[PDB]
Design a protein around this ligand. Structure first.
Ligand SMILES: [Sr+2]
Length: 156
């Protein structure tokens, strides 16, 4: 019950898998695809890529990113990333997933973002809980993207 703050924001959706292996402390995130992304380019679509940050207590611990897809609002990635999070630490971290529009000049604008893990809610909490309940199993789920202003206020 709960969450859902991004639902009416019309930014798009992202699908990713989560897998956690407690003995090894291995957390794997596979960025699968995004859909219905907000159009960001004047007279165009978007050039989306995805950033994945591991966070704790407002601190960005590790940063990864996908390749850039050109001229699409429905990119497919299928790109895997892993983090080392020991089992005594896994309930205390966040994984933050941001979709951005690439441009060769200027700060790239976020389309929207979500996070799973500590302090997550709604479908975000559900995905994380499903990961934890099923050691070694990859669990794929869709998430609604939310405006950066709101998500960052929750992360800070
Ligand atoms: Sr662009």
């Amino acid at each position: 019950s709960g969450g859902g703050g991004g639902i009416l924001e019309k930014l798009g959706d992202i699908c990713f898998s989560l897998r956690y292996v407690p003995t090894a402390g291995k957390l794997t995130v596979v960025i699968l695809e995004a859909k219905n992304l907000k159009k960001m380019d004047v007279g165009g679509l978007s050039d989306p890529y995805v950033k994945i940050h591991l966070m704790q207590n407002g601190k960005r611990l590790k940063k990864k990113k996908t390749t850039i897809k050109k001229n699409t609002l429905n990119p497919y990635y299928n790109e895997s990333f892993s983090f080392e999070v020991p089992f005594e630490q896994i309930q205390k971290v966040q994984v933050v997933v941001t979709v951005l529009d690439y441009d060769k000049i200027g700060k790239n604008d976020a389309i929207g973002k979500v996070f799973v893990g500590y302090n997550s809610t709604g479908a975000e909490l559900r995905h994380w809980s499903d990961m934890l309940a099923n050691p070694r199993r990859p669990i794929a789920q869709w998430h609604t993207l939310q405006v950066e202003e709101e998500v960052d206020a929750m992360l800070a």
